[PDB]
Symmetry: D2
Subunit: 386 residues, 4 copies
């Protein structure tokens, strides 16, 4: 079962199924895919849409006539299949000119070029219907301490994002930005390394309402963080504008495994939170079919991303709907966690002897939280062992 359809809003980057398998130690293992063929294959699997970097759709250095033809073929494939383009982004990391950054390159001419390259692709993104424009500053950072003054780099990164907000406002575009954190790789340390740092940075932009985050499962896990907890803080802040789904085994190079691989229980709690919270954005996969695979394995890996999301969605819904789980959640006081601490106000709390002088600390300490019984009901639901 678990068959995706376009109504599930699953999307994939052209660069995901199109990854040719080159890595730090290895040459390509697959031929390049035409974006037209990836749109057709993904639609056959039940995807809703695709996303692109500028340079995935239009080879870098293309003439205007070449650009127009690449976009015309791609639009025909979208129209032939009903696929959408909800998100686009800029490649500010592959070309050697970006070796020290795009928006925070030490060279000022490079920073200006990075902005012009981004702006040209925002116009194209809006042409193709994108609602979200992602920015992953993979080259922003350093391998050594003297190379990059981070307060000056954050001043340049704020100027860049502010200028992009002024551009979209000036054009009357509805598109919003989603900043994608990553802690390292390819730079030794990347600026805005986690969801928290990106959220904090956005609050200092001139028009914060135009910007949110695009967290990626594997990126937060490369810092050993809890990805569902970081998504909860982004939702709490109203800033989950987009999300990248994949798998990662803890603290390593960015593996980009299919979604559901890597930390399976974290995938379960992530789906439980997105579905509980009513997240309505695309369920986007930023993954790489392993370079061991041929094209049949590429499409099997892409299909597995969607299948795993739909299995986990069913099991998380059954967990939350089970009367036995609902009783366990009240036994563990999840209902009390959702009640205000002191709606009575500060003076009432200060005058409340039950909160201090007559609080029986030992009786409260003795009360078990019952978290292990609750977690084994969660395990039983995930494994289909109820």
């Amino acid at each position: 079962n678990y068959q995706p359809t376009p109504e599930d809003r699953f999307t994939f980057g052209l660069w995901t199924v199109g990854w040719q398998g080159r890595d730090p130690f290895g040459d390509a293992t697959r031929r390049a895919l035409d974006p037209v063929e990836s749109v057709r294959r993904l639609a056959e699997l039940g995807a809703h849409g695709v996303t692109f970097h500028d340079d995935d759709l239009i080879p870098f250095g293309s003439s205007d006539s070449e650009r127009e033809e690449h976009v015309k073929r791609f639009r025909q494939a979208l129209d032939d299949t009903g696929m959408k383009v909800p998100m686009a982004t800029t490649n500010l990391f592959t070309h050697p000119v970006f070796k020290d950054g795009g928006f925070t390159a030490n060279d000022r001419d490079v920073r200006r070029y990075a902005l012009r390259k981004t702006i040209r692709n925002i116009d194209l993104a809006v042409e193709l219907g994108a609602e979200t424009y992602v920015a992953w500053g993979g080259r922003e950072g350093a391998e050594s301490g003297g190379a990059k003054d981070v307060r000056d780099a954050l001043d340049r990164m704020k100027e860049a994002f502010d200028l992009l907000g002024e551009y979209v406002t000036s054009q009357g575009y509805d598109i919003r930005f989603a900043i994608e954190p990553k802690p390292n790789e390819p730079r030794g340390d990347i600026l805005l390394p986690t969801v928290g740092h990106a959220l904090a940075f956005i609050e200092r932009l001139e028009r914060p309402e135009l910007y949110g985050v695009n967290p990626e499962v594997g990126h937060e896990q490369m810092a050993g963080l809890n990805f569902p907890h970081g998504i909860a803080q982004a939702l709490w802040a109203g800033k989950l504008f987009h999300i990248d789904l994949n798998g990662q085994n803890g603290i390593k190079y960015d593996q980009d495994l299919r979604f559901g691989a890597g930390d399976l229980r974290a995938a379960f709690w992530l789906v439980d939170l997105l579905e509980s919270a009513g997240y309505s954005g695309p369920r986007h996969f930023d993954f790489k079919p392993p370079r061991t695979e041929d094209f049949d394995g590429v499409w099997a890996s892409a299909a597995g991303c969607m299948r795993n999301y739909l299995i986990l969605k069913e099991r998380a819904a059954a967990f939350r709907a089970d009367p036995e789980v609902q009783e366990a959640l009240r036994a563990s006081r999840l209902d009390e966690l959702a009640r205000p601490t002191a709606a009575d106000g500060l003076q009432a709390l200060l005058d409340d002897r039950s909160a201090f002088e007559e609080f029986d600390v030992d009786a409260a300490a003795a009360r078990g939280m019952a978290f292990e019984r609750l977690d084994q009901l969660a395990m039983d639901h995930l494994l289909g062992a109820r």
Copy 2:
């Protein structure tokens, strides 16, 4: 040389040199220290002051007469030595009542008690002259996904911090709060796990100006992050209200080694940034003399925290003052990083053919950043090998 004096503003927690050596697998290796003796010994070493949790100064469950006598003896030791108390904090983690949290415990009665316990110690902190009140929510978090809804927990954590801000405002106190992130330990994941998450959270409090961060070297390193980069983002945001200095070897349990141990080059770049930025707060050590040590080793370890800061301060100042380093920083375009990208404005950037149509991308890509020569001058300065 490298002799600290009280003018260097070095401070230590009572619980640092007073740690008796109990760990997950081991009993105490040292007897308890009277706070009066730790104040006298630290002052002899050249410290400026000390800090405390409530329960380090006044044993938990003390009567009012016992509380008054503990505080009177401590005040006499401060007066005898000239030591200050710049910071205090609450212990919301040791007693079993806090096993699921203080401010975000699922039990509402526990959350109210945690607030009352904190408020009682804010009054004492102000009595003793503290300017900063730290909050390390070490028990806020979870070992399992169903135990803690993080959006509800952040709602409780905001209510708690807002009530503390209303209390200090109502009393006319000048004290400010500093939230201390940690990614895990003792909980499997701790809420507000990094400097970024704490900065983002503060922006949603009702009176954000009252709150900053108290980052700790080892805590950000437990997530594999670059501690100088996170301090730069806190400085950029105007939120470095306090800092905890120690050593850590990467991604492990919290080691709390003396400052300068663990990642030595990160200690160098940290001191370079604090001194360059003119940070004026205490240089506070939150460390543990290893449990292998006797009391002579406790004081040698405390002395080493201050010595290492002063050696690194000298070498970072010599690096920044060296004409050869200043020329290397211009060769690596650190001066251009500090210039605005587009003070000419968005329309001028859009009309600038030198930023796109006539930008020679290959000539810019060919220009080396000269970062390795700059970093080996930094290495040579740190090692005294110029």
Copy 3:
């Protein structure tokens, strides 16, 4: 379903369900358990047996009459329940005398005492029927580089293990040793940090046949390693004498979560390998019910260790027995991996033009490994989604 019975050979340490909840930052949350009560409760859950450190069964410093009474009560509980004692071990880590090690303490008198304490408990272990005697050198190591010369420490560690082998041989005992690696915690680095280092060390003991490894899920995961791969290398070497089962979330402090928690897919592949290989030793749990729990939560957490093993055993058996998986394993050439590379011999390989001069490297490179389809069949079996 998934009800364990003593025939499943599940065992637990007294110190697991008996953990009182003390951690680096927290006091006990549960009262001490009498070993007699833990034997009765574990037997009711379907355990096969229990294991102990000397000091869990006989308080440190007990008189001979106290020792005899503790052992007599424990033996009565074993006889009343039918529980076994397959393994015992020494506590060479809690008492402050072991602050720098037992067998590799810098103090020679401490090393001799550690050996005498171990030998006294080997005699008791044999009295109680244990076949395996574990040694976890949690204090062997260092926080600083000058404190511990590791070649001298390995010379002391080999002398200690050789003397223990001479003792068991001299007594005619059948018991064998199992060395338990851990990479860090409580020492900053622990000697013999992984399964590989322990296996390599054993090959240099005088009677290597007497020693194997007791790997623990969470310990290898604290180094970011693949626990099933390390168990495969221990099985390949004939050295898996015992195993400790629990859960861990990657690279952190040792969490000791119940088995099946932490890395669930690694738990699946571990059970698949132990069952495929016909491992016949105890399935021992070295875990800690979280300190949030009361005693009801302790027994629920212990029950969950066994339940998760039995669910994973069923799903791994169904995976290996499924004709569709067997066809996928041949499509991925798992059958060819198990065939000798060159049973024809070196000269035949050198003379084989199909291995070099006429090997079509591009045709072989083009053949996909089909690993993603195989892994999604594994995912579907684990989740009960076939």
Copy 4:
């Protein structure tokens, strides 16, 4: 000062200074270097020699006449400069045919080809005077659990190494093998992930004396391990046949920073151990000048590898020679660590009441180890702050 000369035995791989800067997310930033030019530039810096993979010296797929000309030009550069070739190795990782491994590929034809490719380059290595032949099985491993049965893969890896030992013995060559562990990257988990696993594996080869390890600083640090401790265990086993020197910041992708970068104190203790132990092999750098650099930065980064080794060699020698350090080492009982525990024998230990019945455990526990004073003397020596 700190000028290297060929007598310091510093060597570099052609692929180190020749790295063109391609990474998972980026195109080359530097042109290819002719090996003749790298030999000349490295000799000018004071290197002793160079090392190569087959495919660095002879492009893959070269004809015999092309092979002969590449080798003739390289030999002329060695003769012109006096540079040596102490080590060579095979590239069994770049070409797509090795996407699932060389020696442990699931495809048997690939395993046979990997052996033939290795054997052809052993002959060339011996022609050029190499004493050590490295094997880094970077493709041996898996991203998923069903793809690779590790006991079958270890059987194939032992067959491969045994056949290589039979080949060198049959030819009467003096060359020895050095197996290079790495825990992950490019495979999700690599087989023989650490020094310990490689040492353990070697003991099961048919002629173990022909094989040792080639540990790399950054590889063991990618598992969070202590690299000096792993080198000490390799020295203890008599198996340090070669070593790769570089820098790494903990648990991340393999950074290959210049030696002395990354964990500086670990670099200090490594040099102290190699020099103390009288290691006589090459001091080989396996590093990558960052892709931010031009060729001037490549040679500055290479020069910095050698400079940092020579600074650390001076400071470690001064530490060990300082009478104050020698007194601190006796205060910390490093002398007692080097004395046998029980040269009196097992029966004497059993009859020694001073080892048990009359051992004053509390007096021994009270004695501090004085490790912090010793470590701050080490810090002071490293920083030139005595």
